[PDB]
Design an enzyme around this catalytic site. Structure first.
Site, PDB file in Angstrom:
ATOM      1  N   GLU A   3      22.513  84.409  -1.298  1.00 18.03           N
ATOM      2  CA  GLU A   3      21.359  83.989  -2.113  1.00 18.03           C
ATOM      3  C   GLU A   3      21.026  84.945  -3.261  1.00 18.03           C
ATOM      4  OE1 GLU A   3      19.975  81.086  -1.866  1.00 18.03           O
ATOM      5  OE2 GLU A   3      20.477  80.425   0.153  1.00 18.03           O
ATOM      6  N   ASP A  58      17.272  77.445  -8.673  1.00 16.07           N
ATOM      7  CA  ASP A  58      18.372  77.512  -7.713  1.00 16.07           C
ATOM      8  C   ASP A  58      19.540  76.607  -8.154  1.00 16.07           C
ATOM      9  OD1 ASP A  58      17.799  74.882  -6.903  1.00 16.07           O
ATOM     10  OD2 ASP A  58      17.047  75.428  -4.915  1.00 16.07           O
TER      11      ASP A  58
END
Ligand SMILES: [Cl-]
Length: 164
Positions: free
Chosen positions: A11, A20
């Site tokens: 991440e 994202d």
């Protein structure tokens, strides 16, 4: 290696609101804020998450606090889900990390939809499970990350994360 280091690799860490892989406002270590296209809505969620009026910017300590909460929430989601819990219970600790990773990325409902993969994982048919897991929007949209997670399910080792 462990679930925290694993997800930190997958991440990254960003202290300012970013989008994202799906284009959704996110912060820290993959903390999804909202699916709304409104940056103001994202900022509102951030302030509520952190408990203070932010400037779309948080500290590393704050990012890690959210991260720990999110890892907790993923484990919680698995244990409360009738489809995920037995598979999770059946797994060794390394493969359990792979399950948490998936839930962290796509949510309990998304992972619970991998019915056939889940069955193969519970049967410990690792190569078959790996092949099935890759037949997914998930693998197609995030192939390098999905490959790492699938390798973890296939081998029960951290080999996919050791160079990282
Ligand atoms: Cl990569």
């Amino acid at each position: 290696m462990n679930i925290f280091e694993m997800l930190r690799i997958d991440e990254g860490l960003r202290l300012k609101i970013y989008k994202d892989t799906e284009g959704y406002y996110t912060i820290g270590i993959g903390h999804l804020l909202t699916k709304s296209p409104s940056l103001n809505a994202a900022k509102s969620e951030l302030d509520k998450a952190i408990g203070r009026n932010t400037n779309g910017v948080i500290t590393k300590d704050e990012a890690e606090k959210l991260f720990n909460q999110d890892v907790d929430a993923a484990v919680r989601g698995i244990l409360r889900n009738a489809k995920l819990k037995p598979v999770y219970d059946s797994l060794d600790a390394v493969r359990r990390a792979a399950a948490i990773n998936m839930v962290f990325q796509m949510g309990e409902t998304g992972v619970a939809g991998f019915t056939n993969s889940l069955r193969m994982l519970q049967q410990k048919r690792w190569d078959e499970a790996a092949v099935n897991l890759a037949k997914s929007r998930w693998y197609n949209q995030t192939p390098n990350r999905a490959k790492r997670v699938i390798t973890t399910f296939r081998t029960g080792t951290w080999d996919a994360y050791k160079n990282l």
